[PDB]
């Protein structure tokens, strides 16, 4: 099954096109690579729980 | 009969092009007569109104910052017992033998996680990573470990 | 009383003047109005 | 030369079966018509336009109150009134009637079921004026109009029929070209005669079932449907017929298609059949159905459903006795 | 025109996506529903149903008269199965047995009632 | 101005028909070079070996035409002589070797060394020895392959483009 | 459009932001943007040169004009992004399962997690030039895998209802004030992108030496 | 779960399960055909 | 004088293949039996290539008309035959603007599979419903309904944009093919849509080759129906010799 | 392992067991029901403040009309839309390195995204399941068997490593004349 | 169970063959005949074509009734059915067991079914009558219309046996409603055929030439019927060429009139001197006029020529 599928897939042209969802992983790190602005280290007027 | 009874009691004819407001104020023609009515509305709404911050933008610094420019250098402090525990754990993970369920790249991955966790890998960690990768035959990865040491 | 009552009925406003006209169809808007809200 | 434009199509009647046609055309035009909406009551026309607009159309709409504006604006007209007298008033008799005032190339189509001579005169005078006239009697309920399932029996030029097929297919599923100049009216006449005969037959059959002692009307309908004899009219009237027979005192409901409607339609047949010299009486069962429907109408039940014939079969027979 | 604004195509200015057409397609366009003919093991729908009856709370064998024929049994979906008036568990058992037969698993299981 | 749909006319003819509208002015030509090269090669494929007199004979023989049915030459239905397989049934060997460079460039996302495609081209040559000998080191073959390179940066001086293409020409003429 | 008995109001500013008179640099930025901006932009100006076909002109200006003008606040020459397609991974099950993934509906998937879904980074996260796009994907009811169109990608963020009818970037000043000036992870990323067929085949690669022709 | 076809070895015991859980050699063979289709 | 209550010819479109099949069946039966051919989508017109190709054999379908079988759906229990003409599910394309895809070849440019590992559909199996077995369900949720106008109404296909939904279409199933006494499915590629670059001669050749298969299929159907009812239905029998 | 078992929600191999991708619902009428792809334990934890391991995404099982029809209309862009958000990086992490389990409903949903093959239970009613013969399979394997080194190198590229440098890249990285 | 077929006319032999074929030795089969040689021939043919269950052959109702559980009669005429069921000395219902079931498929009068059911209930058995409609080839292929009238639980017990030779089986109610269903179906068929004749004659009078299109128009419109859908293709030629004699058909005017002959007896009273049956009576007039013209066995499409005579009796009576 695998070999027939692979030869068929190679001989097919459309499916040779790249697929970003299956090709790679982007940013496998624990934290974002840029600052989205957050966090806000300051409370709010309706907020009493300061720290 | 139901359609005969159900008339258009809901909608109203749209606004002409240069129509005024329901308070009579207008833009580009009626100036300094226009009044601000954002202070008559209730102070708080229990759910965003269709016009809640609909058009709101952010600085261009946000979209033109490079990657990892925002990370500030903070010195994480931990007990010496924690240091020993974590160093031994990382050394064991690096020295884990490949083939069964771990691949040689995993030694380099675990060396890099030490950096990403704000740990200072020791010469023993570097030696172990180089030894394991060389034993697995990944000489380019061993040189990558050496370059990581130098870059550190 | 609605929450926008003061904006609606502020003296000299378009809506206030329209209300004054509809209350007395032939006032003189320059002088025929009332400053206060009291009825 | 001319200028690229969206063909103007107008709808005249807007009765029970007229406003669904306009609604279908407005929904399915896709900004290709600039639809026109004529009505004697401009309040009625504006109501139709407002309801259609809030429900959401895909074309602009123009309200009309008098036939001259419709004549000068429309390129194609569809006319679906209640009675042949109103059809005549709009098409030929009125001072500003459409056919009497038709422009070169304009197209007119009628869905109202009118007489063969009326259709002949309409088409002839349209041809004299230079325009084109298709007599297109329709069959189907306003529900069928909403679903887009109507029969059209068009008689007229094949060229104009082919050109107008795209507009017919917006509210009519089964569209046939029966020929020219009254062929559609003849087909509709035959269809109405057949409907009357089959309705009478179904009423008598269900009365037989009740008399013989069958109360499983749904199972009887299933047997008939699977069997060698079964009519769409029986399938339509079976539940109401049983409900009405079982409690004989029950007054029939009122429906869009009524006994007076059938009688008016069959009057055109009575006029158009030949052999007046031989007093034109070769059709016994058709005569019997006509008798029963006439009795039902005379009983003050002419505005009700076709199923009312059950209570008036014997009244028609008594009238026959009176001969 | 109908609207007060003789300048606007739609007087009520509906959202341009209110008028956006909605296309459609049926599961039949993608895959058909073939019917597996009766075999010697379950020659008819009543035999199929009595074979499917294994559970004391799924008395499939009580509704042999609820279907007209093999094809009527095999074509009726869950909605029509409920409409015919079958309990939830018996309905699910019949549907699952039919689908297993379709996938190639005949109703061959041990009756656990005893 | 929208006509009545008596038949189910398709809303869009091609997948990318509307996508080509969303390309900048220069990007339209950037893409057009490649797409037009592909279209021309695919149109010429059916008559690849035909001589001038034979293509004229094909045009004369296919003499039935409606208002704007088509020209018999663009996608001629004439039976080709050499039976091929894979992409060679629709494109020439030169365009086969062209498309691999297009793919390498696309995944590379800009200028790149020739080694990224040396081996793709060499595998193609090993796969089709007859066409390799027939079309290798040919001026037409090399130029047809190499017309791609400018689209990496549409406006670069002649010196920059020629130094960039020197490597590809080196390998294609070796 | 409006409904009965609701007395709608008027919004004077699109957003709440600091005025440009409060800083010398904001003032200069606004002056430069105004000089680079039109004052009244018409159907004939440069920003509409992408309506190269009469059908494009008619469809853009006739209906869905609100949609087109709202698809993007700024004024550009595209009003959208081109779509593209992805290859389906080989199904070792084969024709037993090739029927799957074909349905009655378009299935849209948008990526989330860290590094994705931030409003402040919206224009960078759905930029085609970014190595780390949000990777939206649409499966058509016929099984085709395609990318998302600019509006579908933009529908996964917070609403942004405003437009700029006079700034046209190409007429920005240049060469007087605007004179812009200037680890192995990049090599590793190029390696990732680079084809790797050579692994199966300084022993440099050469053209085949033909044997049958000798 | 494990399927108990009507035609495997039955346990003629009235103090427990009425069907054993063994299987005919045909059921052993066909089970592989299902196992293999699952393995791919 | 025939015992058949009628034969339906269902299709997705009623332009070319259904019209040609109706004409061939009508000619072979010599108008002695009822044939009704309908399609799910009626917004079409009989194809001029179909008319010309039918004339080339002698039958003029120019008089026929494109219509949907919504009327016959209500009576489906009465008709005796339910022929259904449709394309193959393997070459099917939901995009009309492309040629058909390739079938699955069983056992070198195409990959040929093993007949045991990739078995065909058993031929003795019947069809429950094909693409030609659906019915249009029109619907509309007007905002003039006070229950649909409310903010928390689910009779919508969206949210925050508008209320209700204008007239829209949905297709139901009609799993009643098997209620008929003789149901068959005919697999034929599309012919009514021209491929992107085809020329009129080839577009007509496709109609001709599909006409041949329709002719042979109708002959087989009429033979089996003759065995079914027992009467004579190939009354004409003038065309099969040629 | 309870004296009286939870009769309505039995499981395998005790608690909390292996992590699993399930398609969790909400206690709401179907008319508003929506699902969320979550990673959790086999025995659902309703004791700790941490109910789940990771939130992969959300799925709306109610089709939505294409609001984006005018934008560059492509083939059949007007068909109703089924909306879903999916965390592909976290899914790959938990699927590959953590070897968590996958339910059939999420498997079918993800097969639509090009992330996994069509499920084992997404079986077409038409083609019957295959029938295997050892002799035929052996004949095929011998007829077209790969060679040892190509097979091993494909396996190595797929599983062990994918950044293997060329001789050119090694030479480029190699240090130069001064050697400092 | 033991199921035994007794009718064995022309339409009864297929029932026995189908029961024998589809029994698969699950139920025992019995065959009775007036003469033993005929039943021996039938059993020989069934075994030669494949017999799964042993078949027993009976000359006498006594053995027939005292052996089998279910008895199925498919006879020719009401008199034969009455002979089999009641008036015989060894009458099936008279000697019926307390639990055995008897079904009759021959078209008998409602009163006949009344006596049959009453006597079966007296003896404690269950009798439900299931008149059949269709062709002998339809029986061969297994398609038939059975409209059974009797006890609901007994009908449910009998479902599986019926399906062996019938497709469409319905329960019309209790106390012999099957005969009423068959009778009313025949009356309605006759009425629709008459109406189709009227419509086509009127179309020809109006002078509409293309009947091919008018057939689809009527079929897609209201008032459509299978009788029209059937007789139209013949009627078109038969009215434009009235000279040609209508062809013979298996379903005939004489058959319709024989099957309608039970209606008068099943209706309450005819002494009212009026017809509460306009359409049905008009159809009967034309059918009788056609029969008296020497056209009894010809097709049902012959009503066109004798509709005009269908007025003479209406005027004179």
Numbering used by the authors:
A (entry chain DD): 661 to 711
B (entry chain DD): 52 to 203
C (entry chain CE): 25 to 63
D (entry chain FM): 2 to 324
E (entry chain Cp): 12 to 125
F (entry chain FP): 2 to 175
G (entry chain Ca): 336 to 517, 530 to 548, 571 to 583
H (entry chain Cd): 10 to 49
Authors' own words:
The assembly of the mitoribosomal small subunit involves folding and modification of rRNA, and its association with mitoribosomal proteins. This process is assisted by a dynamic network of assembly factors. Conserved methyltransferases Mettl15 and Mettl17 act on the solvent-exposed surface of rRNA. Mettl15 is a class I SAM-dependent N4-methylcytidine (m4C) methyltransferase of bacterial origin that modifies the mtSSU rRNA at position C1486 (human numbering).
Using the data from recently published structures of mammalian pre-mitoribosomal intermediates, we analysed the T. brucei maps and identified a number of previously undescribed structural elements. First, we detected homologs of RbfA and Mettl15 (previously referred to as mt-SAF18 and mt-SAF14, respectively), both of which are associated with Mettl17 (mt-SAF1). Structurally, RbfA is anchored to the complex by its N-terminal extension, with the C-terminal domain binding Mettl17 and the C-terminal extension binding Mettl15. Together, these elements stabilize the subcomplex in a way that Mettl15 and Mettl17 form a heterodimer that is bound in the cleft between the head and body. In total there are 43 hydrogen bonds and ten salt bridges that stabilize the Mettl15-Mettl17 heterodimer, which contribute to two main interfaces. The second interface involves catalytic domains of both Mettl17 and Mettl15 (residues 484–512 and 176–198, respectively). These data suggest that in T. brucei Mettl15 and Mettl17 form a stable complex, which has not been observed in other species. In Mettl15, SAM is located 42 Å away from the methyltransferase target residue cytidine 582 (C582, equivalent of human C1486), implying a non-catalytic conformation. The Mettl15 conformation is different from that observed in the mammalian m4C1486-containing post-catalytic precursor, thus implying a pre-catalytic state. Finally, we identified 13 hammerhead-shaped densities ranging from 17 to 22 Å in length, coordinated by tryptophan residues within a helix-loop-helix motif of pentatricopeptide repeat (PPR) proteins, which likely represent cofactors such as acetyl coenzyme A (acetyl-CoA).
